[PDB]
């Protein structure tokens, strides 16, 4: 009762929060672990992702040893603001939120021996650079790097509380991904060097693989069907000039519409992806199918076709015979090269 | 030991007045600045600004903060920044900026025994960049970042790049979505006025836009459509349905390309090189259809006009491309 208040008031008498524990005597060792409640959405346009974590930091401060009936002291956040705490920040964080609804989501616990546990709930938005050269068959390793902002390697070092594989724990229902598949995470620590000195950095990499089925149904299949439709015109009789002309131009318009829509579904990057080359090839095939018809029509001598009751009628063009084989063959070879190129990496 | 550091800090902060600059009555205090750029993102052509995150370090000497008997550099808690004097440094072209505060306010204060103070900040700032996009997408941009003192002239404060040309790091590690950083420059100069000279630092980049996507999605399809519109010249003049359907469908396709590139590309309300090229191809397919209308009127209301057009149209279009690509490259 009153002993609790006495111990609380006695703790901070003479304490100086401006100085890290063991300043000039030893290295302040911080043990950290992360529990990911939800691996939130990944934004391709902004090249960033959101993550909701329970961040836990533990360290020893001999200046806060206490003796009393209780073994653990739980500190109010106001009192927790009067005590030195690590200035841990995320190197690739962009705009993070420390929730304080309805109260500050922080918790400071002190054991009798002076060991402090500091747990906080955070929402971190971190940038994940992406190589979209293999879109939509790409895989990424979105990193999460954190460490001390002001204290060098000679003052504060971070370590994982348990074995690094088990130190970062992701909830079973954590994944909130529509377009990716969270395969796993790797946990490691390293050293960085800035203009202010050497720092210890704790890194966690989440490995994501994009789902391809949506682009197969929305983009790849309609483009393949449109190319087959354009090559179908090779089987129409050469005297149906308006029919094959309308077929060719309307297939070109259909391909243009599909190309535009397929590009609107891709984040705004200025380099060429795999789907850009696939659409460009389909565009080239439909263009060639129409130039081929222009060449067939240029040699059609007679304007009347063969009739069932059968006067001289035109024979089947050798260009059409060649194209009925070459175009499906060339398109099948392109498909095999494209898929074996990108699906085997 | 530790109590000695505590008393040293108490002595340093005893009688310190944050309202007075170092060497208040003497020479101006030299402030050295260096910037470590973490990333550049959201280079917006519509808003004419870019957003960058950087580690902004400032070094200056304050004899009031000189301590002896401790052979270590005292890295103190960031809240001690509220108890010291820091330069009134602001970014002139900044539109919206903030300092990250997770898990705490991302700033540092490191003291050296001779009195040198290191004051570091982690700042994400959206800086204005007026862009000339008349040559878009074959353009280059020059986006700057101005650093100035709000209320001090060159008699009170001075700025310089600590480390010279090596002051700014991380430029070569940046990878923008639709740009490519060519070079960056550091400029130190004084803004001379009647009242006095004001220190100013300028960090500038040169962005070169990548052209692969525009080649694949804008120029090549328009060229293919324009070439397709020439097929009408090799069909017999009496095939009215075929030639009219081909001409008006190529016009519809060109309109579809123009309007969808209008929606897809950023809203830049003035004439660009992409608009001139799209309009040129639209005019060419319009004239290709008007040629057939003229031929049909001549014949009914003739192989020479078609033979002439089969050469003139490819030649004129090739000359237009040659002039276009020589003008903007």
């Amino acid at each position, epitope marked *: 009762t009153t002993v609790f208040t006495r111990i609380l008031d006695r703790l901070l008498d003479g304490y100086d929060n401006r100085l890290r524990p063991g300043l000039g005597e030893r290295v302040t060792e911080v043990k950290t672990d992360i529990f990911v409640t939800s691996f939130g959405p990944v934004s391709d346009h902004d090249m960033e992702y959101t993550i909701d974590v329970f961040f836990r930091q533990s360290w020893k401060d001999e200046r806060l040893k206490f003796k009393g009936p209780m073994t653990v002291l739980r500190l109010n956040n106001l009192m927790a603001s009067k005590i030195w705490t690590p200035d841990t920040f995320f190197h690739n964080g962009k705009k993070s939120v420390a929730h304080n609804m309805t109260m500050p989501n922080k918790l400071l616990r002190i054991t009798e021996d002076g060991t402090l546990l500091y747990t906080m709930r955070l929402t971190v938005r971190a940038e994940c650079p992406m190589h979209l050269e293999d879109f939509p068959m790409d895989a990424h390793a979105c990193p999460l790097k954190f460490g001390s902002y002001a204290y060098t390697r000679a003052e504060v070092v971070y370590e994982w509380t348990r074995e690094p594989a088990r130190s970062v724990v992701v909830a079973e229902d954590g994944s909130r991904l529509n377009q990716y598949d969270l*395969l796993g995470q*790797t946990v*490691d620590s390293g050293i960085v060097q800035s203009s202010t000195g050497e720092y210890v950095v704790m890194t966690t990499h989440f490995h994501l693989k994009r789902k391809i089925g949506y682009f197969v149904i929305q983009t790849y299949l309609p483009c393949i069907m449109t190319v087959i439709l354009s090559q179908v015109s090779f089987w129409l009789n050469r005297e149906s000039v308006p029919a094959r002309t309308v077929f060719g131009v309307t297939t070109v318009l259909t391909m243009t519409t599909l190309s535009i829509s397929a590009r609107n579904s891709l984040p705004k990057v200025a380099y060429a992806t795999a789907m850009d080359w696939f659409i460009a090839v389909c565009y080239a095939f439909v263009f060639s199918a129409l130039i081929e018809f222009a060449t067939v029509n240029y040699f059609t001598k007679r304007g009347y076709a063969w009739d069932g009751k059968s006067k001289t009628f035109n024979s089947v063009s050798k260009i059409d015979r060649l194209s009925r084989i070459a175009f499906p063959l060339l398109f099948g070879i392109f498909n095999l090269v494209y898929w074996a190129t990108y699906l085997n*990496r | 030991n530790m109590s000695f550091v505590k008393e040293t800090v108490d002595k340093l902060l005893k009688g310190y007045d944050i309202r007075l600059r170092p060497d208040f009555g003497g020479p101006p205090v030299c402030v050295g600045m260096n910037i470590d750029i973490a990333s550049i993102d959201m280079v917006s052509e519509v808003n004419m600004d870019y957003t960058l995150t950087m580690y902004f370090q400032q070094y200056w000497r304050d004899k009031r903060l000189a301590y002896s008997g401790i052979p270590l550099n005292l890295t103190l808690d960031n809240r001690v920044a509220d108890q010291l004097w820091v330069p009134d440094t602001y970014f002139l072209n900044d539109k919206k900026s903030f300092v990250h505060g997770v898990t705490v306010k991302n700033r540092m204060i490191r003291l050296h025994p001779d009195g040198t103070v290191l004051y570091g900040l982690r700042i994400t700032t959206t800086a204005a960049c007026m862009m000339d996009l008349r040559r878009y997408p074959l353009d280059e941009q020059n986006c700057t970042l101005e650093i100035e003192s709000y209320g001090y002239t060159t008699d009170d404060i001075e700025f310089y790049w600590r480390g010279g040309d090596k002051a700014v790091t991380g430029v070569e590690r940046i990878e923008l979505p639709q740009f490519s950083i060519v070079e960056h420059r550091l400029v130190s100069r004084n803004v001379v006025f009647a009242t006095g000279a004001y220190p100013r630092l300028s960090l500038s980049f040169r962005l070169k836009r990548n052209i692969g996507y525009f080649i694949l999605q804008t120029y090549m399809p328009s060229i293919l459509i324009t070439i397709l519109s020439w097929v009408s010249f090799w069909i017999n003049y009496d095939a009215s349905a075929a030639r009219v359907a081909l001409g008006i469908t190529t016009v519809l396709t060109m309109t579809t390309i123009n309007t969808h590139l209008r929606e897809t590309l950023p809203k830049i309300p003035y004439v660009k090189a992409i608009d001139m090229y799209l309009m040129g191809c639209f005019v060419f397919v319009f004239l290709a259809l008007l040629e057939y209308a003229f031929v049909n009127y001549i014949f009914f209301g003739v192989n020479a006009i078609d033979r002439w057009s089969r050469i003139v149209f490819p030649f004129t279009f090739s000359l237009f491309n040659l002039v276009y690509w020589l003008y903007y490259v």
Partner: nanobody
Amino acid sequence: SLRVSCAASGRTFTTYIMAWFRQAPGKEREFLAAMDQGRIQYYGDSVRGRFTISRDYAKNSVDLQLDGLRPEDTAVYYCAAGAGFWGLRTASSYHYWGQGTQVTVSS
């Protein structure tokens, strides 16, 4: 003191993880060091504090500084670059591999 370089051509590795690997004769391929886009340096236990990795982003190259060499280090050294998919220490995560260099140490 020995310095080993690794020039990269045909592709800019600004946003790729550039690493060094050691392959003892017949044993296996051993991870030595790495550096990602953010200049974070990773090292193996056997070479922690001994080897230094540095990246020349302008010249698109990665250098390795070997100090305190031992007969155990006599092996083939490779230069690797990859996205670090499924761990940045596994050799299976790296795709671009150098032709290799032979280092022989005699005392």
